[PDB]
Nucleic acid binder design. Structure first.
Lengths: 150, 109, 116, 52, 205, 71
RNA sequence: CGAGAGACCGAUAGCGAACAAGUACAGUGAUGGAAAGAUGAAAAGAACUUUGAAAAGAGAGUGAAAAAGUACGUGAAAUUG
RNA sequence: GGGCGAAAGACUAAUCGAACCAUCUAGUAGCUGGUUCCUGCCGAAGUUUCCCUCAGGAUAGCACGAAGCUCGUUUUAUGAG
RNA sequence: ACUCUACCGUCAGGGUGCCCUGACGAGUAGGCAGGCGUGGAGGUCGUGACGAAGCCUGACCGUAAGGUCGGGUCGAACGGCCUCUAGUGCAGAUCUUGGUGGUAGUAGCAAAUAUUCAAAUGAGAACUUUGAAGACUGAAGGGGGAAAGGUUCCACGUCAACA
């Protein structure tokens, strides 16, 4: 996970570990909802999952397009993730559901933690030419979503 | 004051930083230099006069188990006057109730 | 010989003749003071008691005796289940002591054969 | 390249399996066997067939 | 080590010139037993049964060494220092009569050593010994009997079994009275209890 | 068996770095000429024959006692 | 086949292999051949209640302790909040 | 060292100018590279007679280590550019 | 350096215990001496479940060598004394046993035979399946036997690993 279950009265979460998923796109999606409260967070993910807005990428580079929708901070670059985002949206859903089970103020709660961990490899192989096998392994993103009492 | 290392420690991690001899041919501290450390000789170090500190220069005596308890003083063993950790907590409390009950300080209560 | 695993070798793949004996537990004090014997082997309808343990000096019987397992189910040391069934529950027989010895046909003549 | 797809022909089937051992150099032509022999005379235990 | 085959190959594939992988070889390296730097190949100095352990010694040092070690018993300070002990400081080594033979049981034996004054060498063991490391934790090296006072017989051959069974004792003869029986663990001065007939058999060298 | 001096120098049994079979000069050496071995302008080698061998000094040759007149 | 011991190991050691290691597999092929140990006294291995769709999240019971919860010793770092 | 030729040692399981597999075998390398505590006492040499001899080594020059003892400044001349 | 005076290193003499004290002390090979060192052991008592090795962390003498005490914690192992013995100190041969890093979430995503629209079922539908309609081939995208393989067809039944 990373962060603590700060107190089970304040907390409400959901895991989503050992996925075959793009590694940078999970924690970059996590940035733009972390710190932000759950009502702002869920809006941002349902916009970028549909056609509306992008997620401006910051922590990671690569060949990605600079465009008008690069604003989140004073940033130019962005990309618009989709199947990565549908996973993270499910964590906001269950964390908000079980926050009402505690009896907090679920949709208006502060998102304390979300990032992703990795350590062991989930080993998969695919072939290439000349009697060859190259690496074709997945990145196990350990995606959580903790909300705290706010 | 200029601290010592083993050389090439600042480059990579495959260096034991405790002092080894500069073995074969050239090294900056072999042919003698006082800048990028020195080579430790018997010219450096503490002298044939002194040895063994505390804030009152007091030497210890380890009184571990209940073998020889009545040997510990209150003169040169006033400050440092320890027990032994490997020897049980049962024995530790028994020795301390005699040792500190001389008229001395001991670190542990 | 003097060996941990290679001493346990004989205990593990012991024949059925030796597994009679190795279902052992001590005898109680008034069984020793009646007869003489150290230990005698442990069987189903014996009244049992726990020696060393938190189940300290309680009354019991044995339910089952098992051959290869060595462990016996002990009656009166009874817990339930998740489904709720009051079962007799396992213990190794070294943790036990028997209070019953029967007389029978010629266990009567076993314990008093030629030596006794 | 002269090799692998040409070896994928194999119309002439050389070796089948042995009864007693499992050495599958039991040729239909030669009737040889590197292991115990099929057919044999004595048991063909050869000394060079081990290092340790 | 020769339980695998691994060959040289070099560049063109991912293995060195060193015999690592060849005709098999997972973590089993070497062509034969080769590669001590390689794990699962050979050793630097592979230990052998052929190389020496058993060495020679003079016989004229044997009868001198037993005489020297028992001469260290005759001075009281060497005895009571090392590990062995005694209440009775003078008249060492101790000589009793041939009534030592008239002891049957260890219950009588401990009582005899109590009276004469060789009992602080006897009782000295309080706790036992568990194990220690290596072949100390494996085989018969667990419980050890103390080399306390030595008992010495006289009439030869059949020694006393009664004074085998005293806690921390040894039994021996006057003739059979070897090196380790007087000086166990290097340093000298072990307490010896002789009989009357044994101490006159000792009037040789 | 000086483990301290030998392993922490690696000069014991070698000398300087590249000394291989040039230094002992192979192992043995012959009678006459050969390249880079321990032969050179040596004084041993020559004659060869060991023992004071003759047909008188062999079997049935009876030994003398150690027996001086004053001893 | 059994017993005993040697200055003789304690899962990178040593028998191929401590364990379903010749058994999911690979080569025509005597053959090569990995991953791989583990609760407690007693399994009592979480009834019952509550939230979510299963996953997941909280109250409650059992038990010597649940600060022993089944993926069951001690635990560090890159990795990772 | 055989099979084979209108020839190109083309050809024989991607190996053919002598197939491949296994063993003796850990063949061997006069050549090169790598090679694990510290301080103190204390510490040179790149020179030679000589070799079917040359990235070497018998011997000699120079200081290792250990025990026991060992100068010259300069005055009279003599020999040689 | 010159120079003052003290201090550190081995050894000599006078007289033990060692002190006075001369001359010198940059350093690679090399030898000797001295000191610290693992596995193991004759020895083994001492310490231990009222808390042992260990894990982890703090204090932490000063000759370069690496070791005693103390705190959180363990649930059974190991040293006074006294000395002998071995597979005995790591940074490296295009090395060796494995995980993890790197380019990188970047490229690739499988030879240019158009696809458009509606439904059935469902938690989810471009893909299963069905309908409307079009591209496309028809000496084969039609048909069909032997070697070789051997139950892969089939119906039933599942969405986890795995495509």
């Amino acid at each position: 996970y990373g962060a603590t279950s700060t107190n089970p009265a304040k907390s409400a979460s959901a895991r989503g570990s050992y996925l075959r998923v793009s590694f940078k796109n999970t924690r970059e999606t996590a940035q733009a909802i972390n710190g932000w409260e759950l009502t702002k967070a869920q809006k941002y993910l349902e916009q970028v999952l549909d056609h509306q807005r992008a997620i401006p990428f910051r922590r990671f580079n690569s060949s990605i397009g600079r465009t008008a929708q690069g604003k989140e901070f004073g940033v130019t670059k962005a990309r618009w993730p989709a199947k990565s985002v549908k996973f993270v949206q499910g964590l906001l859903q269950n964390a908000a559901a079980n926050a009402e089970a505690k009896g907090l103020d679920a949709t208006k709660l502060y998102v304390s933690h979300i990032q992703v961990n990795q350590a062991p490899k989930q080993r998969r192989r695919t072939y290439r030419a000349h009697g060859r096998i190259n690496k074709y392994e997945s990145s196990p993103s350990h995606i959580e979503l903790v909300v705290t009492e706010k | 004051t200029k601290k010592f290392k083993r050389h090439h420690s600042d480059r990579y991690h495959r260096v034991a930083e405790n002092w080894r001899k500069q073995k074969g041919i050239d090294s900056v501290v072999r042919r003698r230099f006082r800048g990028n450390i020195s080579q430790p000789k018997i010219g450096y170090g503490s002298n044939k006069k002194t040895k063994f500190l505390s804030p009152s220069g007091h030497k210890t005596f380890l009184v571990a188990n209940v073998k020889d308890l009545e040997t510990l003083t209150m003169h040169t063993k006033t400050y440092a006057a320890e027990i032994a950790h490997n020897i049980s907590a049962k024995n530790r409390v028994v020795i301390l109730a005699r040792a500190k009950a001389l008229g001395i300080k001991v670190t542990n209560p | 010989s003097s060996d941990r695993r290679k001493a346990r070798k004989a205990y593990f793949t012991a024949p059925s003749s030796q597994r009679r004996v190795l279902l052992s537990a001590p005898l109680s004090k008034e069984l020793r003071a009646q007869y003489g014997i150290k230990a005698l082997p442990i069987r189903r309808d014996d009244e049992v008691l726990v020696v060393r343990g938190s189940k300290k000096g309680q009354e019991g019987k044995i339910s089952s005796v098992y051959r290869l397992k060595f462990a016996v189910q002990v009656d009166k040391v009874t817990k339930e289940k998740v489904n709720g069934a009051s079962v007799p529950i396992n213990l190794h027989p070294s943790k036990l002591v028997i209070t019953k010895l029967h007389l029978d046909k010629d266990r009567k003549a076993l314990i008093q054969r030629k030596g006794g | 390249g002269k090799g692998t797809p040409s070896f994928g022909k194999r119309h002439n089937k050389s070796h089948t399996l042995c009864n007693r051992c499992g050495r599958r150099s039991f040729h239909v032509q030669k009737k040889t066997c590197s292991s115990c022999g099929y057919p044999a005379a004595k048991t063909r235990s050869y000394n060079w067939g081990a290092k340790a | 080590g020769h339980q695998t085959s691994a060959e040289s190959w070099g560049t063109g594939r991912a293995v060195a010139r060193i015999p690592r992988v060849g005709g098999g070889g997972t973590g089993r390296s070497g062509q034969g037993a080769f590669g001590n730097m390689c794990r699962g190949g050979r050793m630097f100095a592979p230990t052998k049964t052929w190389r020496k352990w058993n060495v020679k010694v003079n016989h004229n040092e044997k009868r001198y060494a037993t005489a020297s070690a028992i001469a260290a018993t005759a001075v009281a300070s060497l005895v009571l220092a090392r590990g062995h002990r005694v209440e009775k400081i003078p008249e060492i080594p101790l000589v009793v009569s041939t009534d030592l033979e008239s002891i049957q049981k260890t219950k009588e034996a401990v009582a005899a050593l109590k009276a004469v004054g060789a009992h602080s060498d006897l009782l000295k063991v309080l706790k036992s010994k568990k194990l220690r490391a290596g072949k100390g934790k494996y085989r018969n090296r667990r419980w050890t009997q103390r080399r306390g006072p030595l008992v010495v017989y006289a009439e030869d051959n059949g020694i006393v079994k009664a004074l085998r069974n005293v806690p921390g004792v040894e039994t021996a003869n006057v003739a059979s009275l070897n090196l380790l029986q007087l000086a166990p663990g290097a340093h000298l001065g072990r307490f010896v209890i002789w009989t009357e007939a044994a101490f006159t058999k000792l009037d040789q060298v | 068996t000086k483990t301290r001096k030998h392993r922490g120098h690696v000069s014991a049994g070698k000398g300087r770095i590249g000394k291989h079979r040039k230094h002992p000069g192979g192992g043995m050496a012959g009678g006459e000429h050969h390249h880079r071995i321990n032969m050179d302008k040596y004084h041993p080698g020559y004659f060869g024959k060991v023992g004071m061998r003759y047909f008188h000094k062999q079997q049935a040759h009876f030994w003398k006692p150690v027996l001086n007149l004053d001893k």
